[PDB]
C-alpha cells in the first residue's frame, strides 16, 4: 500500500504531465497521496496563471465577513458578521493596517505559535466564497474555470443527467483569517490556488482516520452536536494542533505559498489560516473514485449548513433516502 502513514505529497509535474488534469490526479492517487488528504502541486517553471495582478483592485467584496471568535485559544467557534461592501483595493489597505496586518515573526512556526496563542483575542475580515476566476482565458493548464464539472462526472459515471453548474470561488484573507474545520460539500475533492500575497497554513486528517476526529469534536462542542449530528458542516469549529495531539487525532499541517496549487481528497477533514493579505481561488471537482464518497457523505439536515442549487441533485441520486429530509432542511 503506498504511503502507509499518509503522509502530505508533494508533486513537481513537468509541462507535459500539466496537461491532462485528470491524469495526474490518477497519478498521484497511484502513489497515495489521497491517504493524507492534502496533497500540494508545484506548476512547471513555464506555467502562469495570469500575466499580472496589477489590476485587480476593482473587484467587490459584496459581503466582507469578520469572523468573531468564542471559547478558548485551542478550543473555539468562530461566527461570521456581515460588514459593509468594499474594493479589493479598500480589503488590501485595510489588512495592511496597524489594526490587522502581520505582526512581526521569525519564520513560519513563530507566526503559527502566535496564531494559537492569540487568535481568539482578534476578529479579522475575510473576503469569502466570491463567485469568479483571476485565471487568464488564456491558460489552457490547470485552469479552475475550465475544468470537467461534477455534473459531467456524474452522468458519465452513472448514465443519469442533472441540472446544476460548477464555477470557482476567490478568497481575500488578511492575517488570522481562519477556516474551520470541514470536509468538502457531498466529501467532493477541492483544488485551491494561492494566486498572490502571503502563506496559508493547512490543517488536515487522513480521510481512513476522519471519525477520529468527528467524535473528538462531539465532545469538544457538546450543545452543538446535539443539535446536529453533522455539525461540522456549519463550518464554525476550530481545534488547534496541541488539542489534536493530546487527544491522540492523527494528523498533518504544511504551509502553501502563492504560486503553489493544493488538492483536497474525498473525506479529508481540513482547516488553516492565513498569514497576511492573500488572494485564493478554488473550486469543488469529482472523479470517479469520489462516486462512493458521495453515496455515503453526512449530511446536515438541521437548517444552519445551507448550500448551492447543485447540491440538490447529489443528494437526490446518490442517497434518495436521505432526500426527503435534506431538502426540509434547505427549506
Ligand atoms: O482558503 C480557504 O479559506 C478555504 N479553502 C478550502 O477549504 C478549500 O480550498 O477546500
Ligand atoms: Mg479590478
Ligand atoms: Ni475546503
Ligand atoms: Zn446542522
Same mark, same amino acid.
Given at each position: 500500500?503506498?504511503?502507509?502513514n ?41 506555467w ?6 496589477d ?8 459581503t466582507?465577513?469578520?469572523?468573531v ?42 507566526l503559527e ?14 473576503g ?9 482565458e488564456?491558460?489552457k493548464?490547470?485552469n ?5 464539472? #461534477?455534473?459531467?462526472?456524474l452522468? &458519465? $459515471?452513472? =448514465? ?11 478568497y +481575500?484573507?488578511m ?20 494566486h ?18 468527528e467524535?473528538?469534536?462531539?465532545e ?18 476550530? #481545534?488547534?494542533?496541541?488539542?489534536? &495531539? $493530546?487527544? =491522540? ?11 503553489? +496549487? ?18 485564493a ?14 453515496k ?12 448551492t ?5 447529489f ?8 432526500y426527503?429530509?435534506?431538502k426540509?432542511?434547505?427549506?
Open positions: 500500500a503506498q504511503n502507509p499518509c503522509n502530505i505529497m508533494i508533486f513537481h509535474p513537468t509541462k507535459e504531465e500539466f496537461n491532462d488534469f485528470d491524469k495526474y490526479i490518477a497519478y498521484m492517487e497511484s502513489q497515495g497521496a489521497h491517504r493524507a488528504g492534502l496533497a500540494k502541486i508545484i506548476p512547471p517553471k513555464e502562469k496563471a495570469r500575466e499580472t495582478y489590476n485587480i483592485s476593482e473587484i467587490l467584496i459584496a466582507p465577513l469578520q469572523q471568535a468564542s471559547g478558548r485559544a485551542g478550543v473555539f467557534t468562530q461566527y461570521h458578521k456581515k460588514k459593509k461592501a468594499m474594493t479589493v483595493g479598500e480589503y488590501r489597505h485595510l489588512a495592511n493596517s496597524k489594526k490587522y496586518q502581520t505582526p512581526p515573526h521569525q519564520n513560519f512556526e513563530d505559535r502566535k496564531y494559537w496563542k492569540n487568535r481568539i483575542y482578534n476578529s479579522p475580515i475575510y469569502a466564497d466570491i463567485s469568479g476566476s483571476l485565471f487568464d488564456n491558460t493548464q490547470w479552475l474555470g475550465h475544468l470537467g464539472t #461534477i455534473q459531467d462526472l452522468e &458519465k $459515471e452513472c =448514465g443519469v443527467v442533472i441540472e446544476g453548474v460548477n464555477t470557482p470561488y476567490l +481575500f484573507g492575517w488570522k483569517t481562519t477556516f474551520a474545520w470541514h470536509t468538502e460539500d457531498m466529501d467532493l475533492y477541492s483544488i485551491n490556488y494561492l498572490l500575497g502571503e502563506p496559508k497554513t493547512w490543517y488536515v486528517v487522513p480521510p481512513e482516520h476522519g471519525q477520529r476526529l467524535r473528538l469534536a462531539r469538544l462542542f457538546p450543545g452543538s452536536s446535539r443539535g446536529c449530528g453533522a455539525f461540522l458542516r456549519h463550518k464554525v469549529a476550530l #481545534i488547534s494542533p496541541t488539542v489534536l &495531539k $493530546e487527544n =491522540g487525532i492523527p494528523f498533518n499541517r504544511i504551509t502553501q505559498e502563492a504560486g503553489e +496549487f493544493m488538492v483536497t481528497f474525498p473525506y479529508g477533514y481540513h482547516a488553516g489560516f492565513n498569514h497576511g493579505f492573500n488572494c481561488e478554488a473550486i469543488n471537482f469529482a472523479t470517479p473514485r469520489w462516486i462512493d464518497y458521495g455515503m457523505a453526512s449530511q446536515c439536515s438541521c437548517g444552519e449548513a445551507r448550500v442549487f447543485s447540491m440538490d441533485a443528494v437526490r441520486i446518490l442517497q434518495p433516502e436521505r426527503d429530509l435534506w426540509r432542511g434547505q427549506d
